[PDB]
Design an enzyme around this catalytic site. Sequence first.
Site, mmCIF file in Angstrom:
data_model
loop_
_atom_site.group_PDB
_atom_site.id
_atom_site.type_symbol
_atom_site.label_atom_id
_atom_site.label_comp_id
_atom_site.label_asym_id
_atom_site.label_seq_id
_atom_site.Cartn_x
_atom_site.Cartn_y
_atom_site.Cartn_z
ATOM 1 N N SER A 18 2.898 2.674 5.489
ATOM 2 C CA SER A 18 1.470 2.415 5.595
ATOM 3 C C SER A 18 0.823 3.561 6.356
ATOM 4 O O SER A 18 1.468 4.215 7.180
ATOM 5 C CB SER A 18 1.193 1.083 6.302
ATOM 6 N N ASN A 52 11.764 25.322 23.259
ATOM 7 C CA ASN A 52 12.848 25.792 24.109
ATOM 8 C C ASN A 52 12.562 25.688 25.597
ATOM 9 O O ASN A 52 13.444 26.023 26.393
ATOM 10 C CB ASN A 52 13.183 27.253 23.780
ATOM 11 N N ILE A 98 6.576 27.786 19.896
ATOM 12 C CA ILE A 98 7.005 27.206 18.624
ATOM 13 C C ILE A 98 8.486 26.849 18.647
ATOM 14 O O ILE A 98 8.909 25.879 18.006
ATOM 15 C CB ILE A 98 6.667 28.155 17.450
ATOM 16 N N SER A 99 9.297 27.625 19.370
ATOM 17 C CA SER A 99 10.743 27.445 19.345
ATOM 18 C C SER A 99 11.187 26.106 19.918
ATOM 19 O O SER A 99 12.300 25.662 19.613
ATOM 20 C CB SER A 99 11.419 28.578 20.118
ATOM 21 N N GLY A 106 0.808 -1.201 0.000
ATOM 22 C CA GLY A 106 0.000 0.000 0.000
ATOM 23 C C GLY A 106 0.844 1.255 0.000
ATOM 24 O O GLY A 106 1.705 1.438 0.865
ATOM 25 N N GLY A 158 2.981 -7.423 4.521
ATOM 26 C CA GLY A 158 3.016 -8.497 3.540
ATOM 27 C C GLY A 158 4.281 -8.489 2.703
ATOM 28 O O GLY A 158 4.854 -9.544 2.418
ATOM 29 N N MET A 162 12.159 32.139 12.526
ATOM 30 C CA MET A 162 12.074 32.482 13.935
ATOM 31 C C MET A 162 12.509 31.284 14.774
ATOM 32 O O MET A 162 12.868 30.225 14.250
ATOM 33 C CB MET A 162 10.656 32.931 14.279
ATOM 34 N N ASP A 169 -2.400 2.854 7.783
ATOM 35 C CA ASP A 169 -3.213 2.199 8.802
ATOM 36 C C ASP A 169 -2.498 2.164 10.145
ATOM 37 O O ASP A 169 -3.150 2.239 11.194
ATOM 38 C CB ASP A 169 -3.566 0.780 8.358
#
Lengths: 112, 741, 84
Positions: free
Chosen positions: B152, B519, B516-517, B13, B108, B560, B154
């Site tokens: 995969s 830290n 986001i950093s 798949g 498989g 950033m 799944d």
Amino acid sequence: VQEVGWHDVAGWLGRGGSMLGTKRTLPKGQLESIVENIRIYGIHALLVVGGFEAYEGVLQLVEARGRYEELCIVMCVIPATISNNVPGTDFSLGSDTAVNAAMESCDRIKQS
Amino acid sequence: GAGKAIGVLTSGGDAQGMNAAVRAVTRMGIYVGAKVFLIYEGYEGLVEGGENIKQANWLSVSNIIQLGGTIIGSARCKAFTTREGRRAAAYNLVQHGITNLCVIGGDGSLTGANIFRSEWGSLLEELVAEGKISETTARTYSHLNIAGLVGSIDNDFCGTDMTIGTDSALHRIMEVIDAITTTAQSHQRTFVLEVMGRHCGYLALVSALASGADWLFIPEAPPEDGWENFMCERLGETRSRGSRLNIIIIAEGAIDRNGKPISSSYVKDLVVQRLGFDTRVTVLGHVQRGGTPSAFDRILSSKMGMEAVMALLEATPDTPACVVTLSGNQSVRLPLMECVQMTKEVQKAMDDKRFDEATQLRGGSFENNWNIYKLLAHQKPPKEKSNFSLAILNVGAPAAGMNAAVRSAVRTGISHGHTVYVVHDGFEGLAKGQVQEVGWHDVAGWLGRGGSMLGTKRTLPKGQLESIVENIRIYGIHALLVVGGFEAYEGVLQLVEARGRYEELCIVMCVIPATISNNVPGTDFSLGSDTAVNAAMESCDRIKQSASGTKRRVFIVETMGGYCGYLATVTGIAVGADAAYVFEDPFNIHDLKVNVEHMTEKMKTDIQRGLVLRNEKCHDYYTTEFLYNLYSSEGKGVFDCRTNVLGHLQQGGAPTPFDRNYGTKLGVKAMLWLSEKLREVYRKGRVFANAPDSACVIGLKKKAVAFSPVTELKKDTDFEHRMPREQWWLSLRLMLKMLAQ
Amino acid sequence: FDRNYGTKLGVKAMLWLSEKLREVYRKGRVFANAPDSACVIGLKKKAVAFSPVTELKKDTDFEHRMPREQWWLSLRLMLKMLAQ
Ligand SMILES: Nc1ncnc2c1ncn2[C@@H]1O[C@H](COP(=O)(O)OP(=O)(O)O)[C@@H](O)[C@H]1O
Ligand SMILES: Nc1ncnc2c1ncn2[C@@H]1O[C@H](COP(=O)(O)OP(=O)(O)O)[C@@H](O)[C@H]1O
Ligand SMILES: Nc1ncnc2c1ncn2[C@@H]1O[C@H](COP(=O)(O)OP(=O)(O)O)[C@@H](O)[C@H]1O
Ligand SMILES: O=P(O)(O)OC[C@H]1O[C@](O)(COP(=O)(O)O)[C@@H](O)[C@@H]1O
Ligand SMILES: O=P(O)(O)OC[C@H]1O[C@](O)(CO)[C@@H](O)[C@@H]1O
């Protein structure tokens, strides 16, 4: 525990040893009971005059503040023990008498 | 360190992420000094041989990393099942001199590859016996080594935490469901979405959890008898009580207690008959198998393909076939037959109605997620009605997923009977009061909204600590769940140090790292960094497309991330940047001269483009203008340059499904830990938490959650640069450098 | 008795150890977390039994390094009665 007045401690200047009595026990074994007595009497300061075990006991009370509420209490140690082994002090209270007693004993032995 | 050959093929798949795995395998194999062959169509072209196989160079796998699916076919084959096809494939491999074979695909394909390995010697004996090949060639290629990647969506392979391409499929599911939720809320329509998933409801559970779906169907927990009445009770309770929309997810492999399939058409007919709610049915179909792969799939597939080539190089004939997977958040290596037979035993036990035995065999993580979703989905009547109090704050910059963590924290707190308060604008707001009680319905639907709804600030408490003490006393707060970034960590540290002189601040505090950093200390992945990496990935892909259009061009992208260069590194891997300058890797003028020289050589080839990243504060002096002047000047006559600054686009739009789920999970887990500490220290009818263990940072360590205390972590942070002493991800910089010429 | 007891304990302990080691091997890595993964082989009142090491903690006097209860306390009556 009992309250003390001005006259209750007059004349104790020239008496050796300890009038109140002393022990080598440390607090952490009976810390819960210490907490109960601090609450019932409402103590707000401990002036723990004593030797090395005084220093270790106050250390245990400091680290016991983390869980217990009424151990947030001002504590002041006074180093008093013949060996002169409490930290943060050069001459501990009561070592001079011990040195003099040792001096007199060794003088008598030297004479013999 | 190699003088041999490697074979790379994708089969089974297809799932987006394959192209990144093929790129990493090819470029790593060349980097070590081996010979890599691209086997088109997988096993079909392998049996056919000839033109279907061809040797590849560094550029054969370029400009594909951002594409889904595979470029080399992965066509299913049948003749490979029969020994005639396997001997033909062995003849082709020996004729090309391939003695090591990396197979990418599902369970498989790995089973067939391991059988082919097990009989390789007999096939070469047969080939010599018929005279097709010489004995000397057979002796040279007497053994075969295998390394398997689970490609995969799944995510059923038991030996792996996350299989290649499942996260991107969740992104496609989230694109579709966010589209559906608009019209569903508009017309008050209850929708039925049929996700994929062969015989694993992982995609269904993860999509339902990340979407707040009102009912799920998964084969791991088949619905009990007479579940239709319970459907009526829940859906009537929600829709009557403010639920404008409702969503039903159904895995295609859903079954009942008797193992009978439950059709999505049955679901539609039931809801129409019993409630009359306007509703529809939808099958996502094959949309989940394509599209641009998410950043997690690109980074993971690249790392796993590198590790697979390393396994092939260091493997021996006595060693059994092994698969490279994820345990925790690192690249472990497991034997193949163990994981295959473990998977067959699980799937068969599920077929045998031994559902509980399959539950323990799969792994506790699935059951924990199933229990968490059930608790959060619909309101159970609370009964405890404790005396405690909570104030959950948002601190730092807004970061996608913070709303999800606040949602889970509130609802988990309510389920335990607390009186949760929400404080807007962080410590600044708490100083000015601005506190209000929150109910269950007050935070519904905040799962799919980016940024922060409550509002956040960079203020620290110690400037206004007296006012904080006043507000804690008047409202009588007994816990602070400070979800936020680095300034959250520093603020909680200030409150810990302030306990010495204020009695009100003897209060349990639990941080949740969200910025986001990535830290905050004591956490590997901070909540909401994944959305930022994806936004950086999409921005750099668009810039790379613009650069390739106008040939002979380079771009300086100033991402950033503060002083931490996690964001710059990982996005560089996810977009194949030429370099990513970061504070943790100090560099001088000589490195920039070398990088210019690499660009000069590279501009002679067909790929006449370039991209160099730069964390916003990776060096005190070398500004982005300085690099722009240097690259343009020393690169005069061959190319020109331009500059860009991916500003608050990095904070991203809607939170990705991983950040949604991770916020939900950290909210509930931090709340359970907080309700543990918050009653363990109960005395005289009041809370007194003063030990260092009471102020922690809930963080995802190598394996699972760990609650490191704030004061212990104080010795593992650099308050000056605002980042932890030692980060786990520095190894990824090696991959970033090796995948570039 | 000590030679026989040493031999018999060595065999039976090794057999139990191989049994559990084969039991907890799964997905290519050994992992033994349950308390039954650590036991003390001992001849109980009748025959051999494997007691978990942690479960015995409630029946051990770590101050003096001996179990709380011992079976041979009955023999002290024997010693005293056989003497005048
Ligand atoms: N018993 C087997 N022996 C050899 N190869 C097998 C066997 N079973 C499956 N395969 C291989 O799996 C390939 C495709 O089958 P499929 O199960 O749909 O792929 P997947 O690995 O994704 O599950 C087949 O071409 C075959 O080579
Ligand atoms: N939101 C849900 N989605 C899917 N199945 C559910 C959901 N809620 C309950 N169920 C199923 O119904 C069973 C019992 O329902 P539950 O809400 O737990 O009431 P009770 O307290 O009586 O157990 C659950 O074990 C589960 O199988
Ligand atoms: N988008 C992602 N980014 C980084 N790591 C991920 C990502 N998705 C999954 N992982 C890692 O793979 C693991 C798979 O988690 P899972 O099996 O769903 O159970 P749980 O969420 O309870 O840990 C995750 O815990 C995480 O370590
Ligand atoms: O990155 P930090 O230092 O953890 O703080 C979070 C925010 O601070 C930033 O530097 C952004 O700064 P501003 O939002 O104040 O302009 C980003 O790293 C991030 O969006
Ligand atoms: O029949 P197809 O094309 O494999 O698609 C349906 C199946 O494909 C898969 O993705 C198999 O890889 C399953 O999830 C799904 O059941």
